[PDB]
Design an enzyme around this catalytic site. Structure first.
Site, PDB file in Angstrom:
ATOM      1  N   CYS A  31      56.266  20.881  18.198  1.00  0.00           N
ATOM      2  CA  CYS A  31      57.444  20.401  18.699  1.00  0.00           C
ATOM      3  C   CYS A  31      57.495  19.436  19.863  1.00  0.00           C
ATOM      4  O   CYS A  31      56.829  19.840  20.571  1.00  0.00           O
ATOM      5  CB  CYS A  31      58.689  21.073  18.885  1.00  0.00           C
ATOM      6  SG  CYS A  31      59.387  22.249  17.409  1.00  0.00           S
TER       7      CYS A  31
ATOM      8  N   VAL B 203      66.071  21.081  12.977  1.00  0.00           N
ATOM      9  CA  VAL B 203      64.474  20.970  12.855  1.00  0.00           C
ATOM     10  C   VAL B 203      64.099  19.810  13.827  1.00  0.00           C
ATOM     11  O   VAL B 203      64.315  18.721  13.673  1.00  0.00           O
ATOM     12  CB  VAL B 203      64.244  20.819  11.475  1.00  0.00           C
ATOM     13  CG1 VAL B 203      62.568  20.747  11.163  1.00  0.00           C
ATOM     14  CG2 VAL B 203      64.732  21.720  10.484  1.00  0.00           C
ATOM     15  N   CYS B 204      63.248  20.248  14.556  1.00  0.00           N
ATOM     16  CA  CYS B 204      62.835  19.233  15.644  1.00  0.00           C
ATOM     17  C   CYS B 204      62.254  17.969  14.993  1.00  0.00           C
ATOM     18  O   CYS B 204      61.441  18.073  14.072  1.00  0.00           O
ATOM     19  CB  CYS B 204      61.720  19.486  16.773  1.00  0.00           C
ATOM     20  SG  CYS B 204      60.229  19.961  15.819  1.00  0.00           S
ATOM     21  N   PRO B 205      62.563  16.494  15.481  1.00  0.00           N
ATOM     22  CA  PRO B 205      61.892  15.384  14.667  1.00  0.00           C
ATOM     23  C   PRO B 205      60.459  15.148  14.923  1.00  0.00           C
ATOM     24  O   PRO B 205      60.013  13.960  15.630  1.00  0.00           O
ATOM     25  CB  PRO B 205      62.815  14.333  14.993  1.00  0.00           C
ATOM     26  CG  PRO B 205      63.697  14.681  16.347  1.00  0.00           C
ATOM     27  CD  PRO B 205      63.318  16.369  16.553  1.00  0.00           C
TER      28      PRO B 205
END
Lengths: 173, 173, 173, 173, 173, 173, 173, 173
Positions: F167, E46-48
């Site tokens: 993102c 999951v992208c930060p």
């Protein structure tokens, strides 16, 4: 405790035969009176004056329909080895009444005779044919010498069950 | 309980004199042996066979240096009124030994003789000069008829303190 | 448990001498490594393969500065009687390492080896000179046959204390 | 703990494949022996001597039908990143045995190896095909150097299951 | 919780420097406002979005005298490895604000953001120069997109401290 | 608390109509977003800057499908009397949004805003159409002045539900 | 409760003056008798028959040295607003005896008059100059109509303190 | 306690007849109002001013359909003996209302009138035909002298049930 049934138990035991078995206090209901006695340990250097005195008077208990049960925190295997050790070598010899084993210490605990979560204190507990406690003898009354006294209490118990208490002559409701 | 001192108490009491006072179990340490007995209630229609039998044998307890203490959950005032009621009217008459009052029921409870948080069960408790329990007699052994047996146990206790237990002849460490 | 000091104890014991004494686990700090082992009971009909195998290899433990301590829930008096019973009659004979007594079952309980509040399960516990647990061997590794394995672990322990762990060649912080 | 089944678990895991899955200790019942080992953390500056030594000896565990399971409080995602980091950069490289993730710290806690509610202490736990603990190695026996010793204990375990314990020659019931 | 001081902590941390240290929330009292934020785990797929958006707006927090503190249940060692992993390989790159480590999960727990005793839920916690909570943003307000909103709340906080609340014109005591 | 549903309640209430009723937080599920706010007491000498500012911006909440709910520990009867008191005499006048009554203090307690078991602390709680907490604003962010900020958070919430998070460009799994 | 001192309190209060203060029950020790009364709520549509009847008879309480204290779970601010509301608009008007505020509900709780952790039940509690409860009137005796009865009990109390109880003529110890 | 039913009881009792029976408080539901009163003990040297005064006014209670119940911690047997003792000898004589026995002290305890787990404090408890407490009179209002006051409260109770409370003239919703 003293109100209704004596604490129940299901224990391992060494019989007069030197054979092993299980003994429940309820086995004697409507059959025998029970003289359950406690002692601290097998194989000590304190003479076993209570086991020996009681066994020497075994026929007096049998004539009065009393089952003698000796109890300590030792295993049934230790009990058997102490019976296979003669009196001259510090043993109890081939006693003819049952030795029960309180390996978990739960019996001693239920009778409030367990000393420092280790060994049972000396005690004589008389239980009737219905499983009800009639006496507890301890300390200076829980000696081998007490046999004559235990038998007199059994005779009084048996006499009291047959005839009941007596009323003072001049007393009226 | 049976390990060291009997449960201590400080109670209200009606003496032989019909005068009131306070009694502590510790008052008798190094002075007298104590025969503490319990009964359920004063003024009932069940004859007081134990109070009367014990009082009739008072001189036998005095000769053996034993202090008789009767105990119920009734007040000292009720005890006094029951003594001022003659035997012919359902009373105990002027008994010459002390009746202690367990109004809070704490004494009965400490001796494990309290029935349904209401009245004490019949019990005979023999306590030595050091305040240690020697016996507890209950049910069919806690009757007025038991007086002869109580005195024989006192004689055995007193004999055991003087001479100690006996060892089986052929036993060796 | 495995974080710092092994559970401490102060127990009754039968030495190689057949003399009685007290043993504390702390007595061995900065002196000896301890191989504490548990077994269920004395005097049973299951051969004592672990006591005998360990005693047969006693000199191998002494050369490695290891104190052997055997433990069961039996009393020191039972331990002594089992040593005075020869192997041919179901005894352990005069073993030369110490048998400690866990009469209150507190030792077994602290090592999490107490079975149904009655007897200890078979276990081999290696403790270093600082009183820290290095291994616990149980079930099919807690057999008399395991002696060769226990000694190899002692040699590995002693080697690990002297030289520490080894790093993989190609690894870098 | 050491009485019957080893504490059960259902955990997230990074397989030899670098694929994710779930591992339950019960998956190995009647299939494999399990060598469950704990270490504190991934990515530290203390070389991972136990993961690497065990993986270098993977074929020795496979020949003996032993499933190697490495466990720390890190997530499966951290485990995967540490495998994708080569040994030269402080990683473990592509090890071929499973790394389980104890993110909730419940596994470490059930094996009594959780240090200050943070990280697991070093431990080697051998579990049989029935899910029963055979050994716990800790402190100076829970080193990478211990691999040779772990395999000797597996050989002893496997030999003990096949042949049972041995009785002393001269011993008789 | 919202009455006086925000839950205190003393944690391990990876600074902008990639050097390790300790951070206490009290270090910022009378110095900086603190924007403490939680995220579940390092190294996931999951992208930060929150770490990156906040770091991209670091200068906006510095101009407003706000210390950014990122927190997850991962170790400081994992934090450092995730910073040494570039964005193109699933890492966070060299972010210039501090990442604290909640290895014992006690911080997450004290802020009531610990999910199933495993990972922290996403949360933005604004704390004033006296250590008092001003807001908690969660769920659909705890997104990377929320940066513009966090800064507007900081401007409102700072404006409210300077000028206080306003009273309705026509209201009178 | 912040994990799933906001604490549920069933309370007495004074509507815009000045008519009484019952309000449950669940009444608004799948219908409206809820802006639940707390204040300490009715009838005090501190101007009610939050009730008045929120009511002055009522149409801004209605356009965004938000139900305003004001809450204090006062009864519905006190709420009604404060609405029947004009602003010039220290009242709130005829506000058109609902005032709920937390007479048992259970609502304040469930939201962790109850001060010394007496009154609620100032708080703004935004709840979504599924009954999930999105923010909690307290202390210097729980002022009447905060209305502009609350509405911007509602716009961000509504925008975040529609489009999700963004993102970072160069980030890859 | 009825044994020694009435539950103590330190509460906020609206005096006859419409000025605020603090009232402790102990302020009246050795000064006044206290007639503490409870009612559920201010501003309801049930006429305040007890506050009004008691205030109408204020001079009868003052002549008998009795301090009237009215108590409900409402704040002192609500009490003041209800006094500033005339009887014709559902208020109590300018009553000249003190209204105490039980905002935390602790007073009601200590007097065992708190209904469903919300409001106090109707009760009249008469307390003597030593702070000892003399009566508790509830349900159909806790009505405004009861004023004549309360004053007769005060006269009986005051008469009983002066002269003590009377003994039956023919009774003797 | 004062919310719904008065504490229920099933007690032993001595009736006016001097016959024994059982009394339950529920026996009087929909039949009689109950004036339950407590006193400490039978047979004391404090004159029984409350039993005698109440019995002297028995016909006044009967005309108002009130059942008088006297209660102390004494047994029914003690109650009977105190009735068979004339007033001249310190007794109560043949009173014609019921004396209940609270041998377990549970009644006194449920009414919060038990003093030091021993005796009941003096108390007058008026209970309506539905079993609901209307008053509790204690200390200087629980005297024999209070009979006139008890009857006036019964007349007020009976009048209040018939006509309800009165509203202040000028008050309006």
């Amino acid at each position: 405790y003293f109100q209704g049934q004596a604490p129940s138990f299901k224990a391992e035991a060494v019989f007069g035969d030197n054979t092993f078995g299980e003994v429940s206090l309820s086995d004697f209901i409507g059959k025998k009176y029970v003289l359950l006695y406690f002692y601290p340990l097998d194989f000590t250097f304190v003479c076993p004056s209570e086991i020996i005195a009681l066994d020497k008077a075994l026929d007096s208990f049998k004539e009065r329909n009393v089952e003698l049960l000796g109890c300590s925190v030792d295993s049934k295997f230790t009990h058997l080895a102490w019976k296979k050790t003669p009196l001259s070598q510090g043993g109890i010899g081939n006693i003819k009444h049952t030795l029960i084993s309180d390996i978990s210490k739960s019996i001693a605990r239920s009778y409030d005779v367990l000393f420092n979560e280790s060994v049972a204190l000396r005690a004589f507990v008389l239980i009737d044919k219905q499983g009800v406690v009639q006496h507890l003898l301890v300390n200076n009354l829980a000696l081998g010498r007490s046999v004559d006294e235990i038998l007199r209490l059994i005779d009084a118990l048996q006499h009291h069950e047959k005839y009941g208490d007596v009323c003072p002559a001049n007393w009226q409701k």
